[PDB]
Amino acid sequence: VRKLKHHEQKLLKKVDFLEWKQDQGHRDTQVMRTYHIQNREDYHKYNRICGDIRRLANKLSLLPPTDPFRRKHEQLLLDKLYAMGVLTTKS
Amino acid sequence: QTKDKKLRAGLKKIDEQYKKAVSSAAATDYLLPESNGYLEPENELEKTFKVQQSEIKSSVDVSTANKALDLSLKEFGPYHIKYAKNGTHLLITGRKGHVASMDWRKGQLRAELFLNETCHSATYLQNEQYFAVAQKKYTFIYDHEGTELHRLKQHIEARHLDFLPYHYLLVTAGETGWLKYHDVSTGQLVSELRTKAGPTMAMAQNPWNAVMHLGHSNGTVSLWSPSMPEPLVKLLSARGPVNSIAIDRSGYYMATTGADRSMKIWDIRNFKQLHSVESLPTPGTNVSISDTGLLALSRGPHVTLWKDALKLSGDSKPCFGSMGGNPHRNTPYMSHLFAGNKVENLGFVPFEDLLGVGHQTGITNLIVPGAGEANYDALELNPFETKKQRQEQEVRTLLNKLPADTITLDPNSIGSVDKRSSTIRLNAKDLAQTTMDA
Amino acid sequence: PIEYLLFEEPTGYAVFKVKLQQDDIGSRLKEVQEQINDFGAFTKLIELVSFAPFKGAAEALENANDISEGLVSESLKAILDLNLPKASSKKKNITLAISDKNLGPSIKEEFPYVDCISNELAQDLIRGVRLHGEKLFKGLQSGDLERAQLGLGHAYSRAKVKFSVQ
Amino acid sequence: MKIKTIKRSADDYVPVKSTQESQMPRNLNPELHPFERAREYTKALNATKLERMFAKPFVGQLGYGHRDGVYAIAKNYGSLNKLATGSADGVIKYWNMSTREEFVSFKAHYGLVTGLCVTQPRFHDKKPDLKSQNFMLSCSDDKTVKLWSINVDDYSNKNNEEGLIRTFDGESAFQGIDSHRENSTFATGGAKIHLWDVNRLKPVSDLSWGADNITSLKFNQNETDILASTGSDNSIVLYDLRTNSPTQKIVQTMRTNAICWNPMEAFNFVTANEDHNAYYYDMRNLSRSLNVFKDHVSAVMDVDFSPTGDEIVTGSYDKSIRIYKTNHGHSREIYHTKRMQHVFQVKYSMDSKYIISGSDDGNVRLWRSKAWERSNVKTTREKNKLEYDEKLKERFRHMPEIKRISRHRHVPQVIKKAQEIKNIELSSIKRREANERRTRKDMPYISERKKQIVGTV
């Protein structure tokens, strides 16, 4: 706004109009530029899926390790997420 | 008068000092440079509301006649007009994709964003510079150039959007029932409030008090505050839903317009309805209150105005027509009807006397003489405000922001005493006499 | 209590009035020392009362060669007849702030009721007068200092070197 | 059909010149200024957060300091620049606080110095100059009082006798000094207080209420003939010179280190007592102290009344210095640094702004009175707002968000545990009173202004 003075500073230690904790570092813009994607809601249309991967990853981590469901089930999933190619390696 | 030789020299000093400054407030009544515009019939045959805009724009000054506008923007949807609180910058939003942050008097254009999402309403938040539209789902925060500043993850529906400028506190209430206040200086959401009443049909702030008034499908205009999670007071204004509301700048007076072909005039100091316009022929979708105290109404293609509607006598009750020229009955002040439009909102320009009407084809400003206040206070809001005078006053209001916790129903009760603790000061004698009762 | 001061120039003399004295315990501070570069702050100290310009350039040389001796010229004697209110000789003198310790006795020789102060307090004010320069004089100085220093600089030098043009 | 609309005319409100400032038309209607109470609250709440930000009390120290420790500070009430400090080594030094250097340093006494006072003499033979010299008077352990001249660089009116005009020998070890501003008069503190003429080597009149040692003195500023005299036998005896006689006595519970008369009211005197408290009296009625000041943790060594007449500044055997108003009964402000220990002597400025402070550590530290008042002379725009803060801070002084911020100070940790002890101790003693309050029928509750007096004469 003004490059406010030193005594203005200490009362306004926390105000900022451009960068918010809600706004989360503008990560959504910062990767919209690097890949040049058209509409804005496209990011959080992926980031709902990319979060939903981890929520299935988490609850499949809470099963015990020597379970022939769990051992079958994420390797069933890494087959798909590598065929689609979102992740580099299958190991 | 209590028996104290030390206090009465101090307390009668203060009571006489209070008398000196208040009578010296009317010293500056002479210093008012300009006086409010008026309208006269001058006859009995000449009615004050028959005058059209083609008769006004001729007989009025050239500068204001150019300050009436016909922005015809026919391809995008029906527009929503919000002026800034100083009279300068107009903001409009198409229902389909325009958002234009025009400078209005001069012909400059700050930002024109085409959004392919639908858009409902927008206001300028803290200056002409930062505004906030209400998109399809997510309220965005824009800059004077058209930049995005924030995609608000929260505020997940926003039909009605409002700012209140002494708290830096953006307020939303969408089709989700919830009521969210976003302190846009820090970015920290202050308070999220469950309304419990369903989709918010009408919202408009109270300027004197900074409480806000939602309107629901019940017809229960609800006063809110970021400290208490219940509504401060509920008011059954009208039957059916509430199409719009508006609040007088003094804070005394409210006007609601339900979808039961009705209209109420409330007194917010004492919560008693003054009088109720019944059976206006088609239900008023929008109202607004001027600064001088002039009422507005929108039947949808109509714009109707009243003078001295907000007073307390029965003669102040607004009426569509006087039988026999009865003076106690209150004829409408000024009327105008558009050809084939349906208006969306209507707001007065703050420091001139026009009202900005937003209709389906575009924008007009209707010229109203008695509307705006003629003499502002240039410490508070400058219509005439340079770059340097603004950005120094942008910081000054931030150091002088008010906390959201300060929002009460009386502004004066922020300095008072708790109602539980006693009126009388306690002696060390009287505190020790309580132990005798214990 | 520094009430009046006297700043000398090639364009005559000046007699100022001290409206407010700067606080004297705190005189090495950053605050009061950075006030004197700032003309908004320095004006609250100093008001101009008098300005009697030299009658000619040749009288300037006679007067500028009289300060460096330490003595009092005709005009410098004559200006202080106006501006200084006459006070007692023994109790409650009038204070004038002088740039020179050596000029001090020669004023009191002529004006017995005048006490001459050259503290680092008082000399701070006179150094403030040089910095703000012609803005204090409110345009009474006809011509400028910047031409007046140059000729009076050479004429004072040529007198003490004492070379004739022959 | 008369129509008038609002015309701004664009020529009044925006200036014609470029250099002319914008005019700023105001309307004092309260409808347009909505938040009366809330704004001026948060202007005062910014006013306390700024005054806790510009809390810069320390301004320097005077020279390189002494060697053994300042036990005595006198002030020329005539000259604003100057004071004199005497170390316990026997060396007195005379300061120019503007330059913060010494005028001259004097190996005065082989014992301790006990008190300094300053007064230009009025000899019967000649007059020593007020303007070209200033005069220090010392009070030693070794039965010795010595006058001292000082060469001073203030006035440039002139251009011998640099030091030690004449010495005053006595019988008992001298404890303290003060001079009397009318006609070359000073009494000493010793085993016997005995009044001195400057022209006479032997004292004029020996005064004593009783045959007891007397440890410090000070004359009053107005009604000048009234003297106040302490006692190590936990007593205070006031003197009157025009009766040539002592006038009354009050006996406190613990001994009084130093006193000070107010200059402005001139019949009230504050005292410094060895129980960790300071007291303030009326000369007319020594039955009731006008206030107590319960803030310290150890013995106060010196108090000084501000020439404003509002404030009283005190220094203790605790390594800290308090400032309080006459009204509130408690310190509004505590001063401390690590580099001072056991302040024995403290004197307020004569322009009432900067607090001098002698210490045992040997330095003369000088402070500010208010932490925000500056040496700057301020413009008319800054002055009104800086006035406007300090008035708006007064009617919102009692808001609990303000009073949390306006009060708290970082006191050192060795002091804060001692106040924690007294809060345990007084709550224990209130329990030790309230149980005996319930047994006996009508116990007289002696008020706290009165409990520090054993009896009077």
PDB file of C-alpha atoms in Angstrom, chain B residues 228-396:
ATOM      1  CA  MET B 228     -22.851 -13.708  19.241  1.00  0.00           C
ATOM      2  CA  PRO B 229     -23.788 -16.818  17.250  1.00  0.00           C
ATOM      3  CA  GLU B 230     -27.497 -16.221  17.682  1.00  0.00           C
ATOM      4  CA  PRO B 231     -29.272 -13.391  15.856  1.00  0.00           C
ATOM      5  CA  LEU B 232     -29.372 -10.253  17.976  1.00  0.00           C
ATOM      6  CA  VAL B 233     -33.077  -9.700  17.371  1.00  0.00           C
ATOM      7  CA  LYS B 234     -35.609 -11.201  14.978  1.00  0.00           C
ATOM      8  CA  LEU B 235     -38.280  -9.145  13.249  1.00  0.00           C
ATOM      9  CA  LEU B 236     -41.234 -10.587  11.386  1.00  0.00           C
ATOM     10  CA  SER B 237     -41.302  -7.889   8.734  1.00  0.00           C
ATOM     11  CA  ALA B 238     -43.589  -9.330   6.073  1.00  0.00           C
ATOM     12  CA  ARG B 239     -45.334 -12.516   5.067  1.00  0.00           C
ATOM     13  CA  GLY B 240     -43.665 -14.704   2.483  1.00  0.00           C
ATOM     14  CA  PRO B 241     -40.035 -14.035   1.626  1.00  0.00           C
ATOM     15  CA  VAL B 242     -38.189 -10.730   1.738  1.00  0.00           C
ATOM     16  CA  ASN B 243     -37.222  -9.278  -1.615  1.00  0.00           C
ATOM     17  CA  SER B 244     -35.009  -6.468  -0.348  1.00  0.00           C
ATOM     18  CA  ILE B 245     -34.243  -4.218   2.591  1.00  0.00           C
ATOM     19  CA  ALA B 246     -32.553  -0.897   3.202  1.00  0.00           C
ATOM     20  CA  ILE B 247     -31.510   1.025   6.292  1.00  0.00           C
ATOM     21  CA  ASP B 248     -31.392   4.778   6.887  1.00  0.00           C
ATOM     22  CA  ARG B 249     -27.952   6.325   7.320  1.00  0.00           C
ATOM     23  CA  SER B 250     -28.909   7.633  10.762  1.00  0.00           C
ATOM     24  CA  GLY B 251     -29.662   4.076  11.820  1.00  0.00           C
ATOM     25  CA  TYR B 252     -33.159   4.878  13.044  1.00  0.00           C
ATOM     26  CA  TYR B 253     -35.220   3.566  10.186  1.00  0.00           C
ATOM     27  CA  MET B 254     -35.615   0.426   8.089  1.00  0.00           C
ATOM     28  CA  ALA B 255     -37.650  -0.398   5.009  1.00  0.00           C
ATOM     29  CA  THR B 256     -38.434  -3.978   4.020  1.00  0.00           C
ATOM     30  CA  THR B 257     -40.286  -5.205   0.944  1.00  0.00           C
ATOM     31  CA  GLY B 258     -41.799  -8.653   1.199  1.00  0.00           C
ATOM     32  CA  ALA B 259     -43.090 -10.714  -1.687  1.00  0.00           C
ATOM     33  CA  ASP B 260     -46.631 -10.484  -0.294  1.00  0.00           C
ATOM     34  CA  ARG B 261     -47.183  -7.230  -2.249  1.00  0.00           C
ATOM     35  CA  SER B 262     -46.256  -5.379   0.924  1.00  0.00           C
ATOM     36  CA  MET B 263     -43.753  -2.945   2.367  1.00  0.00           C
ATOM     37  CA  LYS B 264     -42.860  -2.129   5.960  1.00  0.00           C
ATOM     38  CA  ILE B 265     -41.230   0.911   7.551  1.00  0.00           C
ATOM     39  CA  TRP B 266     -39.449  -0.145  10.716  1.00  0.00           C
ATOM     40  CA  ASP B 267     -37.880   1.893  13.502  1.00  0.00           C
ATOM     41  CA  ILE B 268     -34.700   0.099  14.476  1.00  0.00           C
ATOM     42  CA  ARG B 269     -34.188   2.047  17.713  1.00  0.00           C
ATOM     43  CA  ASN B 270     -37.381   0.694  19.254  1.00  0.00           C
ATOM     44  CA  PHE B 271     -38.246  -2.260  16.969  1.00  0.00           C
ATOM     45  CA  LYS B 272     -41.734  -1.019  16.179  1.00  0.00           C
ATOM     46  CA  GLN B 273     -43.032  -0.785  12.642  1.00  0.00           C
ATOM     47  CA  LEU B 274     -44.145   2.711  11.793  1.00  0.00           C
ATOM     48  CA  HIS B 275     -46.640   1.900   9.038  1.00  0.00           C
ATOM     49  CA  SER B 276     -47.161  -0.759   6.397  1.00  0.00           C
ATOM     50  CA  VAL B 277     -47.737  -0.176   2.710  1.00  0.00           C
ATOM     51  CA  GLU B 278     -50.275  -2.841   1.786  1.00  0.00           C
ATOM     52  CA  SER B 279     -51.176  -3.986  -1.729  1.00  0.00           C
ATOM     53  CA  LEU B 280     -48.787  -2.083  -3.870  1.00  0.00           C
ATOM     54  CA  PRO B 281     -49.793  -3.611  -7.201  1.00  0.00           C
ATOM     55  CA  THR B 282     -46.659  -5.630  -7.910  1.00  0.00           C
ATOM     56  CA  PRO B 283     -44.128  -6.538  -5.243  1.00  0.00           C
ATOM     57  CA  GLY B 284     -41.196  -4.245  -4.740  1.00  0.00           C
ATOM     58  CA  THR B 285     -38.025  -6.063  -5.605  1.00  0.00           C
ATOM     59  CA  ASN B 286     -35.620  -3.395  -4.328  1.00  0.00           C
ATOM     60  CA  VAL B 287     -35.532  -0.422  -1.980  1.00  0.00           C
ATOM     61  CA  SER B 288     -32.899   2.091  -0.995  1.00  0.00           C
ATOM     62  CA  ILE B 289     -32.722   4.980   1.439  1.00  0.00           C
ATOM     63  CA  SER B 290     -31.105   8.256   0.481  1.00  0.00           C
ATOM     64  CA  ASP B 291     -28.857  10.354   2.633  1.00  0.00           C
ATOM     65  CA  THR B 292     -31.401  13.121   3.144  1.00  0.00           C
ATOM     66  CA  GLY B 293     -33.982  10.486   3.999  1.00  0.00           C
ATOM     67  CA  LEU B 294     -35.679   9.837   0.692  1.00  0.00           C
ATOM     68  CA  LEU B 295     -37.172   6.407   0.054  1.00  0.00           C
ATOM     69  CA  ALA B 296     -36.886   4.358  -3.136  1.00  0.00           C
ATOM     70  CA  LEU B 297     -38.928   1.463  -4.487  1.00  0.00           C
ATOM     71  CA  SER B 298     -38.754  -0.775  -7.548  1.00  0.00           C
ATOM     72  CA  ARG B 299     -41.815  -2.633  -8.776  1.00  0.00           C
ATOM     73  CA  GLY B 300     -39.493  -3.998 -11.443  1.00  0.00           C
ATOM     74  CA  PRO B 301     -40.042  -1.719 -14.412  1.00  0.00           C
ATOM     75  CA  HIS B 302     -40.906   1.180 -12.079  1.00  0.00           C
ATOM     76  CA  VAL B 303     -38.858   3.402  -9.810  1.00  0.00           C
ATOM     77  CA  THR B 304     -40.876   5.239  -7.185  1.00  0.00           C
ATOM     78  CA  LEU B 305     -39.636   7.776  -4.648  1.00  0.00           C
ATOM     79  CA  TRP B 306     -41.111   9.294  -1.502  1.00  0.00           C
ATOM     80  CA  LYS B 307     -40.171  12.278   0.611  1.00  0.00           C
ATOM     81  CA  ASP B 308     -40.590  12.253   4.405  1.00  0.00           C
ATOM     82  CA  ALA B 309     -41.684   8.637   4.481  1.00  0.00           C
ATOM     83  CA  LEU B 310     -39.444   7.729   7.379  1.00  0.00           C
ATOM     84  CA  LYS B 311     -41.069   9.943  10.005  1.00  0.00           C
ATOM     85  CA  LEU B 312     -43.377   8.805  12.762  1.00  0.00           C
ATOM     86  CA  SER B 313     -46.711  10.529  12.112  1.00  0.00           C
ATOM     87  CA  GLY B 314     -49.533   8.810  10.281  1.00  0.00           C
ATOM     88  CA  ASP B 315     -49.373  11.529   7.631  1.00  0.00           C
ATOM     89  CA  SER B 316     -45.914  10.304   6.649  1.00  0.00           C
ATOM     90  CA  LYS B 317     -47.420   7.050   5.371  1.00  0.00           C
ATOM     91  CA  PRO B 318     -46.480   6.821   1.669  1.00  0.00           C
ATOM     92  CA  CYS B 319     -49.387   6.490  -0.738  1.00  0.00           C
ATOM     93  CA  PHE B 320     -49.733   6.182  -4.491  1.00  0.00           C
ATOM     94  CA  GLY B 321     -52.289   8.929  -4.773  1.00  0.00           C
ATOM     95  CA  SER B 322     -54.169  11.638  -2.932  1.00  0.00           C
ATOM     96  CA  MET B 323     -57.916  11.668  -3.282  1.00  0.00           C
ATOM     97  CA  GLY B 324     -59.034  15.273  -3.687  1.00  0.00           C
ATOM     98  CA  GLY B 325     -55.524  16.628  -3.174  1.00  0.00           C
ATOM     99  CA  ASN B 326     -55.508  15.762   0.523  1.00  0.00           C
ATOM    100  CA  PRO B 327     -52.345  17.209   2.118  1.00  0.00           C
ATOM    101  CA  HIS B 328     -52.151  14.664   4.946  1.00  0.00           C
ATOM    102  CA  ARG B 329     -51.856  11.880   2.398  1.00  0.00           C
ATOM    103  CA  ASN B 330     -48.353  11.451   1.014  1.00  0.00           C
ATOM    104  CA  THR B 331     -48.194  11.326  -2.786  1.00  0.00           C
ATOM    105  CA  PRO B 332     -45.055   9.821  -4.345  1.00  0.00           C
ATOM    106  CA  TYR B 333     -42.236  12.290  -4.764  1.00  0.00           C
ATOM    107  CA  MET B 334     -40.836  11.287  -8.140  1.00  0.00           C
ATOM    108  CA  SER B 335     -41.742   8.368 -10.381  1.00  0.00           C
ATOM    109  CA  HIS B 336     -40.098   6.844 -13.412  1.00  0.00           C
ATOM    110  CA  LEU B 337     -40.850   3.722 -15.391  1.00  0.00           C
ATOM    111  CA  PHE B 338     -38.557   2.005 -17.846  1.00  0.00           C
ATOM    112  CA  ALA B 339     -39.823   0.615 -21.123  1.00  0.00           C
ATOM    113  CA  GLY B 340     -39.138  -3.097 -21.150  1.00  0.00           C
ATOM    114  CA  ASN B 341     -36.722  -3.678 -18.300  1.00  0.00           C
ATOM    115  CA  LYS B 342     -36.625  -5.386 -14.922  1.00  0.00           C
ATOM    116  CA  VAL B 343     -34.282  -3.684 -12.482  1.00  0.00           C
ATOM    117  CA  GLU B 344     -31.888  -5.619 -10.270  1.00  0.00           C
ATOM    118  CA  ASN B 345     -30.706  -3.237  -7.584  1.00  0.00           C
ATOM    119  CA  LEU B 346     -30.764   0.491  -7.130  1.00  0.00           C
ATOM    120  CA  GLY B 347     -28.365   2.585  -5.106  1.00  0.00           C
ATOM    121  CA  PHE B 348     -28.064   6.337  -4.748  1.00  0.00           C
ATOM    122  CA  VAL B 349     -24.800   7.950  -5.622  1.00  0.00           C
ATOM    123  CA  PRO B 350     -23.491   8.989  -2.221  1.00  0.00           C
ATOM    124  CA  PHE B 351     -22.409  12.597  -2.568  1.00  0.00           C
ATOM    125  CA  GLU B 352     -24.431  13.731  -5.523  1.00  0.00           C
ATOM    126  CA  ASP B 353     -28.140  13.376  -6.099  1.00  0.00           C
ATOM    127  CA  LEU B 354     -28.750  10.604  -8.617  1.00  0.00           C
ATOM    128  CA  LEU B 355     -29.742   7.010  -8.126  1.00  0.00           C
ATOM    129  CA  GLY B 356     -27.951   4.297 -10.002  1.00  0.00           C
ATOM    130  CA  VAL B 357     -30.492   1.913 -11.462  1.00  0.00           C
ATOM    131  CA  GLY B 358     -29.391  -1.418 -12.851  1.00  0.00           C
ATOM    132  CA  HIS B 359     -31.741  -2.869 -15.423  1.00  0.00           C
ATOM    133  CA  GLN B 360     -31.642  -5.753 -17.866  1.00  0.00           C
ATOM    134  CA  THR B 361     -30.388  -3.871 -20.882  1.00  0.00           C
ATOM    135  CA  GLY B 362     -27.978  -1.630 -19.041  1.00  0.00           C
ATOM    136  CA  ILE B 363     -27.596   1.285 -16.668  1.00  0.00           C
ATOM    137  CA  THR B 364     -29.311   4.590 -16.255  1.00  0.00           C
ATOM    138  CA  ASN B 365     -28.826   7.204 -13.595  1.00  0.00           C
ATOM    139  CA  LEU B 366     -32.089   8.978 -12.895  1.00  0.00           C
ATOM    140  CA  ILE B 367     -31.652  12.573 -11.777  1.00  0.00           C
ATOM    141  CA  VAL B 368     -33.293  13.178  -8.403  1.00  0.00           C
ATOM    142  CA  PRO B 369     -32.968  16.635  -6.815  1.00  0.00           C
ATOM    143  CA  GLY B 370     -33.683  15.889  -3.180  1.00  0.00           C
ATOM    144  CA  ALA B 371     -31.651  12.706  -2.937  1.00  0.00           C
ATOM    145  CA  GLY B 372     -28.037  13.078  -1.865  1.00  0.00           C
ATOM    146  CA  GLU B 373     -26.454  15.151   0.842  1.00  0.00           C
ATOM    147  CA  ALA B 374     -24.983  18.341  -0.514  1.00  0.00           C
ATOM    148  CA  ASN B 375     -22.174  18.881   2.000  1.00  0.00           C
ATOM    149  CA  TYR B 376     -19.963  15.961   2.986  1.00  0.00           C
ATOM    150  CA  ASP B 377     -17.158  15.768   5.514  1.00  0.00           C
ATOM    151  CA  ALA B 378     -13.820  15.751   3.762  1.00  0.00           C
ATOM    152  CA  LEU B 379     -11.942  14.012   6.539  1.00  0.00           C
ATOM    153  CA  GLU B 380     -14.202  11.019   6.145  1.00  0.00           C
ATOM    154  CA  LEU B 381     -15.016  10.488   2.461  1.00  0.00           C
ATOM    155  CA  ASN B 382     -13.645  12.659  -0.327  1.00  0.00           C
ATOM    156  CA  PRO B 383     -15.374  12.731  -3.678  1.00  0.00           C
ATOM    157  CA  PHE B 384     -12.350  14.804  -4.657  1.00  0.00           C
ATOM    158  CA  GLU B 385      -9.387  12.690  -3.622  1.00  0.00           C
ATOM    159  CA  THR B 386      -5.959  12.539  -5.202  1.00  0.00           C
ATOM    160  CA  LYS B 387      -3.626   9.566  -5.252  1.00  0.00           C
ATOM    161  CA  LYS B 388      -1.532  10.802  -2.339  1.00  0.00           C
ATOM    162  CA  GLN B 389      -4.533  11.862  -0.281  1.00  0.00           C
ATOM    163  CA  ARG B 390      -6.044   8.404  -0.688  1.00  0.00           C
ATOM    164  CA  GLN B 391      -3.106   6.107   0.042  1.00  0.00           C
ATOM    165  CA  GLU B 392      -2.320   8.090   3.164  1.00  0.00           C
ATOM    166  CA  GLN B 393      -5.948   7.681   4.215  1.00  0.00           C
ATOM    167  CA  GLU B 394      -5.798   3.987   3.353  1.00  0.00           C
ATOM    168  CA  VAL B 395      -3.205   3.435   6.081  1.00  0.00           C
ATOM    169  CA  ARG B 396      -4.934   5.777   8.537  1.00  0.00           C
TER     170      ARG B 396
END
